């Protein structure tokens, strides 16, 4: 099982630099080109560069020469990409991928991708969120089924982690994308259960914000 694991989300100050990692396993690291791709605001990918870990040979998109530096550690089967002097345009998700083109065969082998690394370039300070339970009064949806919610607000930067009953409750939940406003993000999640479930048994909203090492569980009480 071929796998590429990338490092966590990064919050970087304007003008500084970061090194992203892409650890691989399940194949001969030195025999395949590793490519790096950039994605900004959804649909819109850009090819950055590729490196052949066996020789250290690299090719760069002109646009990124001086911005990105690719290296690879054969002893650990890890590819790295350092980004220098970060600016607005550098905020994006970066993927590493064993693309699979075999030059000698002029054909392709399966492509495997890392999960992506989100880089946020900002000078704003890290802020822990406030988690608020949403019990219905009118958000009851009468009997039969009732929907509860969880309001996570005032945190920076992304991401935040939100589950219901430690992941036990996953069906019928809607977690909305965080929206930035006044340098702080707000995110919400709704969960719909049968009237026979709540208030009878407890529904708990679990939230984790790595950046500020915050972990909080809110019990939705009536």
């Amino acid at each position: 099982e071929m796998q590429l694991q990338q490092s966590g989300a990064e919050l970087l100050r304007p003008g500084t630099s970061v090194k992203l990692s892409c650890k691989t396993s399940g194949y001969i690291f030195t025999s395949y080109w590793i490519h790096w791709v950039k994605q900004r605001s959804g649909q819109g990918l850009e090819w950055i560069a590729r490196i052949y870990p066996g020789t250290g040979s690299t090719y760069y998109n002109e646009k990124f020469k001086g911005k990105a530096t690719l290296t690879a550690d054969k002893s650990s089967s890890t590819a790295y990409m350092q980004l220098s002097t970060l600016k607005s345009e550098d905020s994006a998700v970066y993927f590493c991928t064993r693309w699979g083109f075999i030059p000698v065969r002029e054909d392709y082998v399966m492509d495997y991708w890392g999960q992506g690394t989100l880089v946020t370039v900002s000078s704003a300070k890290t802020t822990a969120p406030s988690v608020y339970p949403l019990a219905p009064v009118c958000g009851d949806t009468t009997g039969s089924s009732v929907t509860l919610g969880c309001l996570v607000k005032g945190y920076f930067p992304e991401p935040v982690t939100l589950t219901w009953n430690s992941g036990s409750l996953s069906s019928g939940v809607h977690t909305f994308p965080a929206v930035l406003q006044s340098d702080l993000y707000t995110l919400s999640s709704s969960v719909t259960v049968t009237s026979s479930t709540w208030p009878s048994q407890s529904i708990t909203c679990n939230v984790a914000h790595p950046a500020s090492s915050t972990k909080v569980d809110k019990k939705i009480e009536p």
């Binding site: 990918l45 090819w47 998109n61 392709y108 219905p136 009118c138 009851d140 709704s190």
Partner: protein, 219 residues
């Protein structure tokens, strides 16, 4: 650099129907060795992109042959013979003939389904939040289709435009519907000065606005 143009931007197709996506390049993609390095990728919601086709019409291993690719020179087409639920996502063409490699803008494929009216829930501020001097009234409009919906907030009969934060989910794989969250935030003091808080939606499934409200008072 080669400019790659994809059309349409979005296509809504019903499960079982065919779908085709067009990709045009500013330079022929015919490499000097006679091969054409045109690839098609799919990026499913919340997933990394994945290659579906290489060399214009060659399917990658494990890709369903419901998917077909064709074209030459500067015109290429991806065709899905029968759309299934798992086909939801953004499709991208990317050329590898001319350095540096360039991608098309993407085509989002959305599953066209039967209209679905929103299930609206409204929530007054929590005690915890009021203690902090703040107050957010939340409104969830869950599982509707089409995605087009307009929501306004009305306090004591007057529209409130400031303090509104909206968020939408991507089309749901399980039922092809959309969900939206709308939060109105005020100060604790102002919140306590009004009585009726209304979340009002405008949607294709109704000739009149869809309303959910609550009146705060004391007891």
């Amino acid at each position: 650099d080669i400019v790659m143009t994809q059309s349409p931007l979005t296509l809504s197709v019903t499960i079982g129907q065919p779908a085709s996506i067009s990709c045009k390049s500013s330079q022929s993609l015919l490499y000097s060795n006679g091969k054409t390095y045109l690839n098609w990728l799919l990026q499913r919601p919340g997933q990394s992109p994945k290659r579906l086709i290489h060399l214009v019409s060659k399917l990658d291993s494990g890709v369903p042959d419901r998917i077909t690719g064709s074209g030459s020179g500067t015109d290429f087409t991806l065709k899905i013979s029968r759309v299934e639920a798992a086909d939801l996502g953004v499709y991208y063409c990317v050329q590898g003939t001319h350095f540096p490699y360039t991608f098309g803008g993407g085509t989002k494929l959305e599953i066209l389904r039967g209209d679905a009216a929103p299930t609206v829930s409204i929530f007054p501020p929590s005690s915890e939040q009021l203690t902090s001097g703040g107050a957010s009234v939340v409104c969830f409009l869950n599982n509707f289709y089409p995605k087009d919906i307009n929501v306004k907030w009305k306090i004591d009969g007057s529209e409130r435009q400031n303090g509104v934060l909206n968020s939408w989910t991507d089309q749901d794989s399980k039922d092809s519907t959309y969900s939206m969250s709308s939060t109105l935030t005020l100060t604790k003091d102002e919140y306590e000065r009004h009585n009726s808080y209304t979340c009002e939606a405008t949607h294709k499934t109704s000739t009149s606005p869809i309303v959910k409200s609550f009146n705060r008072n004391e007891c």
